[PDB]
């Protein structure tokens, strides 16, 4: 009975900036590893940013140095700073939550926010 | 030859001297020349044990063997001080005289071989079973849960059993003696107490951990971190190791009667003679105390699971039932043994040694049941299939 809600998406000019946030409610959050996945038009979903419970952040080579993932355990929200947005970053971003259970880790996903980058 | 016949009981110069002593004697030569090759070796077995003059004392027994009355000589050889001194040694000699075969020594030899294969399969089932559990969690990143960390700690305890306790405890029964010295005897017993104590304490941690998890919004998420889980595991082995090695290494288990002192000084004797104080205190601390709180806590976990209760819910509710079988199987396999420890100490010679060893080995087999119980969870079941069947 967990809930993931993304926010911060929308329309932005090329080279701009956006900050995505994902509210998690239904577990401890401080112990679960967060992450951000995006779905491009006609492409499979690609992991772009993921932060563990300890704070180890992993990024994708296509977004390395431009994106920055972090979290606030006081507000139960994982953030994703998006700088120097390109046309290839135009995708629907999903917030991933790896909540560990008794024997296995259960993957929970959000509804997904859409980020469109116009090259005007 | 009868070289293995004397080898099975407790050198070539003594055999040839006993054969020459029977031929020179005027009361053993007529009997030796009337027995088959099998019964002649059984006659030399008595001369090598008792003596040339002692064997001649059985005037009535040798007369019945000379008259080929095996059934009447079997009851006549049971009425002597030699039959009451060693009942296991004499019964095999009487049977050899009566049947004229090696059935008394063959059946005692096939039993060692037959039981030796069974105990070897127990070791193989424990090692292969637990190493599969260790590998399944250490490899698959989806099985990296706090409970599985304690399962790894529990499987390690059962793994050492099938590598340092069960194999050396099996040779102690087949050979009927101990052939590893006193240094390893006090160490083999220390490991034995350690792994059992570390197992019940680890299961006790799981029950408490599942209670904090079921009192959480996720109802199944452990409140411990990955680093804190390793700290608990480390402290469990430290506490259990202090309540296992220190009472043994400091010789707090030693008894006072003469039979125990003679077994402690003997390198070939490794019987676990304990005093009335240590046997109760250690069983209470290392087994009974963590057992009561484990059942009490995990019963409230089952009470909260039925009080708060989809498709996903049944999968994780069965995972709590899976851990309940682990605690239940570990209980129903070590409880009769620790009950005997209370009975054996309070009343001496009330429980047989064979029964005491049997119930001790029921707990040994328990160190190979946990991997089979983990097959109830499809998460563990798939991980096994990917490692073994699919490969
Ligand atoms: C006491 C002796 C004779 C028995 C053999 C010791 C074996 C069973 C113990 C000693 C140290 C233990 C290891 C300690 C730590 C880990 C890390 C874990 O991520 C995988 C299991 C693993 C690797 C354990 C495997 C079992 C192990 C190797
Ligand atoms: C042949 C012997 C070495 N077998 C020992 C048992 O497997 C385990 O015995 C124990 C494990 C843990 C605590 C214990 N307290 C005891 C008190 C008396 C005897 C055994 C134990 C004991």
Domain boundaries, chain B: 3-101, 107-390
Closest alpha carbon within chain A to B143: A104
Query: CA B172 to CA A94: how far, in whole Å?
Result: 62
Query: CA B306 to CA B231: how far, in whole Å?
Result: 31
Distance of CA B193 from the midpoint of ligand 2 (Å)? 5
Which residue ranges of B are tagged as binding site for (S)-carazolol?
Answer: 192, 282, 360
Answer whether A57's CB lies under 8 Å from A67's CB. no
Query: CA B391 to CA B332: how far, in whole Å?
Result: 35
Place of tokens 């049971």: B78
Q: Which residues line ligand 2 (CB under 6 A)?
A: B 189, 192-193, 196-197, 272, 274, 279, 282-283, 286-287, 341, 360, 363
Q: Among B184, B181, B173, which residue's Cα sits nearest to residue B357?
A: B173
Residues of chain A with Cβ-Cβ distance to B149 below 8 Å are none
What CATH number belongs to B107-390?
1.20.1070.10
Q: How many beta carbons lie within 10 A of that of residue B299, not counting itself?
A: 12
Strand order, beta sheet including A17-25: A3-7, A17-25, A77-83, A67-72
Q: Which long-range contacts (CB under 8 A, 24 or more apart) does B18-27 make?
A: B18/B44, B18/B47, B18/B48, B18/B52, B19/B44, B21/B47, B21/B52, B22/B47, B22/B52, B25/B52, B25/B56, B27/B56, B27/B59, B27/B62
The ligand minimizing its distance to the Cα of B253 is 2
Residues of chain B with Cβ-Cβ distance to A101 below 8 Å are 145, 218, 220-221, 316, 319
- In terms of Cβ atoms closer than 10 Å to its own Cβ (0-12, 13-18, 19+), residue B364 is buried
Distance of CA B372 from the midpoint of ligand 1 (Å)? 20
Distance of CA B324 from the midpoint of ligand 2 (Å)? 24
CB contact under 8 A, B221 and A101: yes
Distance of CA B198 from the midpoint of ligand 1 (Å)? 14
Query: CA B243 to CA B241: how far, in whole Å?
Result: 5
Domains of chain A: 1-120 (2.60.40.10)
Q: Among B289, B294, B282, which residue's Cα sits nearest to residue B154?
A: B294
CB contact under 8 A, A105 and B319: no
Query: CA B232 to CA B100: how far, in whole Å?
Result: 64
Tell me the count of A-B CB pairs closer than 8 A: 63
Closest alpha carbon within chain B to A98: B142
CA dihedral B13, B14, B15, B20 (to 10 degrees): 90
Query: CA B391 to CA B374: how far, in whole Å?
Result: 19
Choosing among 1.10.530.40, 3.40.50.10490, 3.40.50.460, 3.40.50.300, the CATH entry for B3-101 is 1.10.530.40
Q: Could you give phi then psi for residue B230, rounded to 5 degrees?
A: -65, -30
The separation between the first and the last C-alpha atoms of chain A, rounded to the nearest angstrom, is 42
Query: CA B199 to CA A39: how far, in whole Å?
Result: 47
Q: Which sign, positive or negative, has the C-alpha torsion B2, B6, B7, B11?
A: negative
CB contact under 8 A, A104 and B221: no
How were these coordinates obtained?
Answer: X-ray
Answer whether B48's CB lies under 8 Å from B18's CB. yes
The ligand minimizing its distance to the Cα of B130 is 1
DSSP B101: S
Query: CA A17 to CA B162: how far, in whole Å?
Result: 60
CA distance B136 to chain A (A): 11
Q: Report which ligand 1 atom has the smallest distance to the Cα of B191.
A: 1
Q: Report which ligand 2 atom has the smallest distance to the Cα of B278.
A: 17
User: Which of B282, B342, B351 to mutate to test ligand 2, by most ligand atoms within 8 A of the CB atom?
Assistant: B282
Answer whether A109's CB lies under 8 Å from A98's CB. no
**β partners of residue A51:** A34, A57
Residues of chain A with Cβ-Cβ distance to B317 below 8 Å are none
Resolution number, Å: 3.2
Residues of chain A with Cβ-Cβ distance to B322 below 8 Å are 103
CB contact under 8 A, B323 and A31: no
Ligand 1, atom 18: nearest CA belongs to which residue?
B138
């Amino acid at each position: 009975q967990v809930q993931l809600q993304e926010s911060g998406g929308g329309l932005v000019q090329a080279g701009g900036s956006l900050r995505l946030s994902c509210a998690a409610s239904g577990s401890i959050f401080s112990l679960n590893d967060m992450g951000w996945y995006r779905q491009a038009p006609g492409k499979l979903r690609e992991l772009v940013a993921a932060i563990t419970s300890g704070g180890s952040t992993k990024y994708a080579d296509s977004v390395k140095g431009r994106f920055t993932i972090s979290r606030d355990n006081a507000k139960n929200t994982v953030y994703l700073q998006m700088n120097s947005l390109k046309a290839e970053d135009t995708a629907v971003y999903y917030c991933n939550a790896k909540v560990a259970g008794t024997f296995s880790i259960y993957d929970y996903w959000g509804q997904g926010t859409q980020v469109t980058v116009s090259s005007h | 030859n009868i070289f293995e016949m004397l080898r099975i009981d407790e050198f070539n110069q003594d055999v040839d001297a006993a054969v020459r002593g029977i031929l020179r004697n005027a009361k053993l030569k007529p009997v030796y020349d009337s027995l088959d090759a099998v019964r002649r070796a059984a006659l030399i077995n008595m001369v090598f044990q008792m003596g040339e003059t002692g064997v001649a004392g059985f005037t009535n027994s040798l007369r019945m063997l000379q008259q080929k009355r095996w059934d009447e000589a079997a009851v006549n050889l049971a009425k002597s001080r030699w039959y009451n001194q060693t009942p296991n040694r004499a019964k095999r000699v009487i049977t050899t005289f009566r049947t004229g075969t090696w059935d008394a020594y063959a059946a005692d030899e096939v039993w060692v071989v037959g039981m030796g294969i069974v105990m070897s399969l127990i070791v193989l089932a424990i090692v292969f079973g637990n190493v599969l559990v260790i590998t399944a969690i250490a490899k698959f990143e989806r099985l990296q849960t706090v409970t599985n960390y304690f399962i790894t700690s529990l499987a390690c305890a059962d793994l050492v059993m099938g590598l340092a306790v069960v194999p050396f405890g099996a040779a102690h029964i087949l050979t009927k003696t101990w052939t590893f010295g006193n240094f390893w005897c006090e160490f083999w017993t220390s490991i034995d107490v350690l792994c059992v104590t570390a197992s019940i304490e680890t299961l006790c941690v799981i029950a408490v951990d599942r209670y904090f998890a079921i009192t959480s919004p996720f109802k199944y998420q452990s409140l411990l971190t990955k680093n804190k889980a390793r700290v608990i595991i480390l402290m469990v082995w430290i506490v259990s190791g202090l309540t296992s090695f220190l009472p043994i290494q400091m010789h707090w288990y030693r008894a006072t009667h003469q039979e125990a002192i003679n077994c402690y000084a003997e390198e070939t004797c490794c019987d676990f003679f304990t005093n009335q104080a240590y046997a109760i205190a250690s069983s209470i601390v290392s087994f009974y105390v963590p057992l009561v709180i484990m059942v009490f806590v995990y019963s409230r976990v089952f009470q909260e699971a039925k009080r708060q209760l989809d498709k996903f819910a049944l999968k994780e509710h069965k995972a709590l039932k899976t851990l309940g079988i682990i605690m239940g199987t570990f209980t129903l396999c070590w409880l009769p043994f620790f009950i005997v420890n209370i009975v054996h100490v309070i009343q001496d010679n009330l429980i047989r040694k064979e029964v005491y060893i049997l119930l001790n080995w029921i707990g040994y087999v328990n160190s190979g049941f946990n991997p089979l119980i983990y097959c109830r969870s499809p998460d563990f079941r798939i991980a096994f299939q990917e490692l073994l069947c699919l490969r």
